[PDB]
């Protein structure tokens, strides 16, 4: 690939962005950058950013743009040499306009999944905090319940996956992030995939990406 790919994946919370991203990075030559993993890492490390982020995350509110754009642009500049997949940034118009001043996004993958469906999924979500690996009791279950397959350490549930917080996160997405979908639609780069199951969507995402980025061994 002479030109490195710059891809974004977007969708309402629980639509499967991180799940699809793990499949993409498994099959395609690109690096996955997750804002949420990055924020949850900053909370473990106790950074300035990590401390102030906790209050927003735990209430289902978007972290201020100034903080998030600086964090994301800084991380991206470490990845000039790779094709990358941005997962969870941008979430607002200022975040999307800033990203554009730095990079030319090739393609924005939009997962359109029912709110009722997604609401139920986040109820059953479990994660391994150190690695960020994601599990569900129905769809991607561990071999033992509540225990990561490898470290054997407790898998946990995000504090933001409580039903009251899920409602708040969905409304924030509707109010602040959907305008970003329209921004990328008018720029000619939005590719939307609708479904209720990741496994019914993945074939189309897979075929679509074959047309944009090399495959991985």
Could you list the active site residues?
Answer: 17, 91, 125, 158, 169
Under the binding rule (CB under 6 A), the answer on residue 91 touching ligand G5P is: yes
Residues 175, 90: Cα–Cα separation, whole Å: 14
Residue pair 127/147 in contact by the 8 Å Cβ criterion: no
Site for Mg ion (CB under 5 A): which residue of 11, 14, 16, 18?
Answer: 18
Assess 129 for contact with ligand G5P (CB under 6 A).
Answer: no
Closer to Mg ion by CB, 18 or 195: give it: 18
Residue 134 touching ligand G5P (CB under 6 A): yes
**Residue selected from 5, 7, 15, 24 as contacting ligand G5P according to rule CB under 6 A:** 15
Backbone phi and psi for residue 126, each to the nearest 5 degrees, phi listed first: -130, 145
Nearest Cα residue to 85 out of 12, 5, 16: 5
Strand pairing of 134-136 and 125-127? antiparallel
Size of the site for ligand G5P (CB under 6 A): 36
Secondary structure of residue 128 in the 3-state scheme: coil
Write down the H helix ranges in the chain: 17-27, 35-45, 48-58, 65-77, 93-102, 115-123, 163-172, 178-186, 198-210
| Residue 3 counted as an annotated binding residue | no
Give me the sign of the Cα torsion angle 138, 142, 145, 146.
negative
Binding window for Mg ion (CB under 5 A); candidates: 18-26, 51-59, 114-122, 179-187: 18-26
Smallest distance, ligand G5P to C-beta of residue 179, A: 14
Q: Residue 29 CB, nearest distance to ligand G5P (Å)?
A: 21
The C-alpha atoms of residue 30 and residue 26 are separated, in whole angstroms, by 9
Cβ atoms of 202 and 23 within 8 Å: the answer is: yes
**158 marked ligand binding residue:** yes
Binding residues: 14, 16-19, 35, 40, 61, 88, 91, 95, 125, 135-136, 158, 169, 198
Binding residues for GTP: 14, 16-19, 125, 135-136, 158, 169, 198
Residues near Mg ion (CB under 5 A)? 18
Residues near ligand G5P (CB under 6 A)? 11, 13-19, 35-36, 39, 56-57, 60-63, 68, 88-89, 91, 95, 121-122, 125, 134-136, 138-140, 160, 169, 197-199
């Amino acid at each position: 690939s002479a030109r490195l790919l710059r891809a974004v994946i977007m969708g309402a919370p629980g639509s499967g962005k991180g799940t699809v991203s793990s499949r993409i990075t498994t099959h395609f030559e690109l690096k996955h950058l997750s804002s949420g993993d990055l924020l949850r890492d900053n909370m473990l490390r106790g950074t300035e950013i990590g401390v102030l982020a906790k209050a927003f995350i735990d209430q289902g509110k978007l972290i201020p743009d100034d903080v998030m754009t600086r964090l994301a642009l800084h991380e991206l500049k470490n990845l000039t040499q790779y094709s990358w997949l941005l997962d969870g940034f941008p979430r607002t118009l200022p975040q999307a306009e800033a990203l554009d001043r730095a990079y030319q996004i090739d393609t924005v993958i939009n997962l359109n999944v029912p709110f009722e469906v997604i609401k139920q999924r986040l109820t059953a979500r479990w994660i391994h905090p150190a690695s960020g690996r994601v599990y569900n009791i129905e769809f991607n279950p561990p071999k033992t319940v509540g225990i990561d397959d490898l470290t054997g350490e407790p898998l946990i549930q995000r504090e933001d996956d409580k039903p009251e917080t899920v409602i708040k996160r969905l409304k924030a997405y509707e109010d602040q992030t959907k305008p970003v979908l329209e921004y990328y639609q008018k720029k000619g780069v939005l590719e939307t995939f609708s479904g209720t199951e990741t496994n019914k969507i993945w074939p189309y995402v897979y075929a679509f990406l074959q047309t944009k980025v090399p495959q991985r061994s």
